[PDB]
Write a protein that binds this DNA or RNA. Structure first.
Ligand SMILES: [Co+2]
Ligand SMILES: [Co+2]
Ligand SMILES: [Co+2]
Ligand SMILES: [Co+2]
Ligand SMILES: [Co+2]
Ligand SMILES: [Co+2]
Ligand SMILES: [Co+2]
Ligand SMILES: [Co+2]
Lengths: 90, 138, 223, 90, 138, 223
DNA sequence: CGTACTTTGGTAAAGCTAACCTAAGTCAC
DNA sequence: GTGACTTAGGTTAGCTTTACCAAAGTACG
């Protein structure tokens, strides 16, 4: 199942990329958990965290810290549970 | 509210597996906003009907029958999201909430029509792969 | 099974009014295939919530809140039927059964998008007027007569206009109606009958078939 | 089935004995239908229309006519339905 | 009121056979004081469960299972009456009305104890033969 | 099954009072082996008819009419148990089960005759006081202690006085008690236990056996 | 001390069959 | 014109499972 065990093994979670030391990444998947908050989804579309758009993931240190991301049209703070639920290609 | 309790427990366990989270009854309580006793009782009912099992470490494993039904619900969900965005033009942020309900009433007959209509989609508008397209025969 | 009991009780009462049948609980039992005691206990539950009232002759009246909710469900149903026929291309006989479930999960937000997409539709694929389009924010049919009454008055030639929700529930019948050509916008020859509760014969463009008294009563034509 | 088809074939109903020209008879069976009326059963015991007692059945003519009987301690009027439900040996 | 509807319909048909009356649904309505529609509906339920059949001339015929059950109820009835007169000393005129209820709650275990106690009785206090004593084994 | 649902609910509430257990709807559910919703809907039906009331702590109180009816059924039960033992000679372990049905069909008229026949009995064959004898027209029990509590207080020898209706429902258990000699008017040796929910050991005249916490709570003795 | 789950006793909604009723109509003789 | 039964639409009682709740306790790390 490409859903749970992706065929593209270079798919990584925004929170794991952030803790690894940030990087420029292509947005691929937004999990169903993230989609459940309409206000957040509006904010993700506005700044440009949507599938097919490149984003900059700012390096973070420690667990339970918000992950700062920069999109094509602004930046936004992702909660660990949200950042975990967004998958990217670096 | 949930439309179908069983299908939302199955898909919620499926969601947690996609997110690489350990599917405990505690996670279902949080995400479906139901009390612990409610979730334990419903999981017990779904274990009795052979849709899932509770392991020694207490994480919920979907059975062959449970995974088959979870895949069916999710496939209907992500085909509905595509119809709602690509064809109907519902706002990007409102589509999951609509698909959250549509996923419970969609026939496999409509699924096959949507596959032709949408030009063999393999992902949702949010980039999530559509599972169980094999099972439709498309 | 019904997905939403309350909405289907409201919509069954609406269907019966549209078909000019007296809405008794005995009708809801027959149509939704439920026990008398279940219908009484559910109608009592809906009476408590002020969605209907039971009169002295025991016929069901929709309240202002009831009629509003009934129209809302019925609007979703026929916009659903339009979407499935016009856009998705689901087979004519399978559409009502699908729409029967969809009418309970469609948002008013989606209805608005569907009105735009489908070009402000005024009728279902089965010729039934779509109500409550005013609530979203978007013809004299007193000349229409029932196939049973036309047959009992001597028959003749007639244009098919409406097939009621009642009739749409049987996929095999709807497949028969389509093949012989008893569909909205097609001409038919209704054969004359004298007896009530007798099956009416009708001749379409590609053959003819038998209609039961309750089916024929639920098909409206213009002669 | 002694209940429905008596082994003693000479058992007769009070109404049949009355219509055929009365006679002296031993009371044998009082059916469950008769027992259902307590006031009647009290009257039947008082006058002696009870199993093991001899009674005199008065001859009657016509259907739907009450059958007069004489017991050891008085007489009483049986309705046709009651008289039918009492069986005797002549 | 009847305590057990099924047992009272069976025994009422058994009564009408003992009295050489043609057992119609009309006779049950009269004797149990129930409306015609009620009796038709209950007889249909008892036909469905294979306790009786409705003949062409519309008289009710007990089946093998129906006759067996009717005999069991009547046997309990007439043993209860013997206990109520010979042992308990309830008044002669009231005993049937009591046995009308007792006949529904008496076990075959008690029936066999009553047979020993009453010295193998073959008739009720009202002279009616006790059927189905073979079936007890006594 | 229950023969009379109302009378069995009333008698279950009475049983729980005699055993010093708080009468909750949950107790009726597990004892009469019915669903929670059944018990609530039936207790609601009996509240409406003024046979009981549901308190704030949700414990069931019998009204004057309810208590009267409860006593009436319990009187018929224990007079029936006496008749089946003293006169008919039904086996000790089968008597309660029979009486469970008889208590619902017996008239006061028959009760009066049974009082004379049985010699004005005051206790059932299981040592339980027969109540409501005043209504027909006809001892300090504070020194009695429960076998579970006797064991939890150190155990010791005791005389069996009462076996509650609860215990009598299991014929196989009653057959065991009879063979071991744990019956009214027999001495037993109760072995000591420390904790609740622990099975109590008891030694009779012809052997010994294990009692479950709920069984031992329902057996009363004099030490 | 926090997390996960259990025990206990509820609830409302939504279904069932058995067993009763009345009013009006049919049906054979 | 009855006596017998049916049609049509109820009713109450007495059951069920599903799917929700909260308070308090347990098991464990
Ligand atoms: Co989604
Ligand atoms: Co959903
Ligand atoms: Co339709
Ligand atoms: Co529907
Ligand atoms: Co009798
Ligand atoms: Co009876
Ligand atoms: Co007892
Ligand atoms: Co009982």
């Amino acid at each position: 199942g490409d859903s749970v065990e992706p065929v593209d093994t270079d798919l990584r979670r925004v929170d794991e990329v952030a803790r690894s030391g940030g990087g420029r990444a292509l947005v691929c998947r937004i999990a169903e958990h993230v989609q459940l908050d309409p206000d957040l989804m509006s904010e993700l579309k506005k700044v440009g965290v949507v599938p097919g758009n490149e984003i900059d993931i700012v390096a973070v240190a420690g667990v339970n810290k918000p992950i700062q991301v920069q999109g094509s049209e602004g930046g936004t703070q992702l909660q660990p549970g949200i950042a975990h639920a967004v998958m990217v290609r670096v | 509210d949930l439309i179908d309790t069983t299908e939302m427990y199955l898909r919620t366990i499926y969601d947690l597996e996609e997110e690489g989270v350990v599917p405990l009854r505690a996670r279902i309580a949080e995400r479906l906003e139901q009390s612990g006793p409610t979730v334990s009782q419903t999981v017990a009912r779904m274990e009795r009907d052979g849709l899932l099992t509770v392991a020694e470490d207490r994480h919920l494993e979907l059975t062959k029958a449970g995974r088959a039904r979870a895949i069916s619900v999710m496939r209907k969900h992500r085909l509905a999201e595509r119809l709602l965005v690509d064809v109907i033009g519902l706002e990007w942020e409102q589509v999951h909430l609509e698909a959250c309900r549509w996923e419970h009433v969609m026939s496999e007959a409509v699924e096959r029509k949507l596959v032709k209509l949408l030009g063999n989609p393999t992902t949702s508008p949010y980039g999530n792969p559509i599972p169980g397209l094999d099972e439709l025969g498309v | 099974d019904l997905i939403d009991t309350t909405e289907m009780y409201l919509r069954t009462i609406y269907d019966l009014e549209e078909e000019g049948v007296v809405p008794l609980r005995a009708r809801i039992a027959e149509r939704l295939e439920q026990s008398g005691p279940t219908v009484s206990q559910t109608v009592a539950r809906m009476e408590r919530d002020g969605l209907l009232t039971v009169a002295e002759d025991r016929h069901l009246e929709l309240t202002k809140a009831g009629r509003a909710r009934a129209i809302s469900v019925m609007r979703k149903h026929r916009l659903a039927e339009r979407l499935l026929v016009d856009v998705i291309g689901l087979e004519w006989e399978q559409v009502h059964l699908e729409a029967c479930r969809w009418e309970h999960v469609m948002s008013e937000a989606v209805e608005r998008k569907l009105v735009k997409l489908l070009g402000n539709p005024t009728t279902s694929p089965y010729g039934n007027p779509i109500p409550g389009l005013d609530e979203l924010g978007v013809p004299v049919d007193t000349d229409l007569r029932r196939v049973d009454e036309v047959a009992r008055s001597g028959g003749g030639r007639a244009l098919v206009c409406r097939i009621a929700e009642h009739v749409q529930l049987d996929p095999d019948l709807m497949s028969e109606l389509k093949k012989v050509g008893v569909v909205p916008g097609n001409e038919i020859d209704i054969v004359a009958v004298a007896g009530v509760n007798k099956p009416i014969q009708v001749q379409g463009s590609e053959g003819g078939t038998q209609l039961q008294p309750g089916i024929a009563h639920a098909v409206m034509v213009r002669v």
